[PDB]
Design a protein around this ligand. Structure first.
Ligand SMILES: [Zn+2]
Length: 150
């Protein structure tokens, strides 16, 4: 039993995917609350951008390549050239390693339970502030916010 979120194809798809994961974890609402932001193709969030942001936001998510990490609650995929995200609806979230997050973990990787305090205080505000920055700067943006917000 799986639920897949497909964001509006504004070119900020990648950041809408992360927004949705956070929006589901926090509110049960598996959709992006971020305003649409039309982006040239050159500024589409890359696998590397998403992976760095996952770590800033400390999300139990993976970018899948070949095999999907069996420890990942959220699975970021692209069909065609647009990012989407699946949630394993049951499944308790597990804290993932860099290899799991990046989608290169090998057969029978291991992950511990994700803690109740695992998610940053105001993670979604952080993402809101940063997602209109150039895609490769967004993570730094997110990190900036989480170090001191208003
Ligand atoms: Zn893994």
């Amino acid at each position: 039993g799986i639920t897949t979120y497909s964001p509006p194809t504004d070119g900020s798809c990648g950041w809408h995917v992360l927004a949705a994961i956070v929006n589901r974890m926090i509110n049960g609402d598996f959709t992006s609350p971020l305003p649409q932001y039309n982006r040239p193709e050159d500024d589409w969030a890359s696998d590397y951008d998403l992976a760095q942001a996952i770590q800033c936001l400390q999300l139990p998510a993976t970018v899948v390549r070949n095999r999907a990490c069996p420890n990942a609650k959220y699975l970021i995929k692209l069909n065609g050239v647009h990012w989407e995200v699946e949630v394993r609806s049951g499944m308790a979230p597990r804290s993932l390693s860099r290899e799991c997050v990046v989608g290169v973990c090998s057969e029978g990787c291991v992950a511990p339970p994700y803690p109740a305090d695992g998610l940053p205080k105001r993670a979604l505000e952080a993402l809101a502030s940063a997602y209109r920055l150039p895609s490769d700067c967004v993570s730094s943006g997110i990190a900036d916010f989480l170090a001191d917000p208003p």
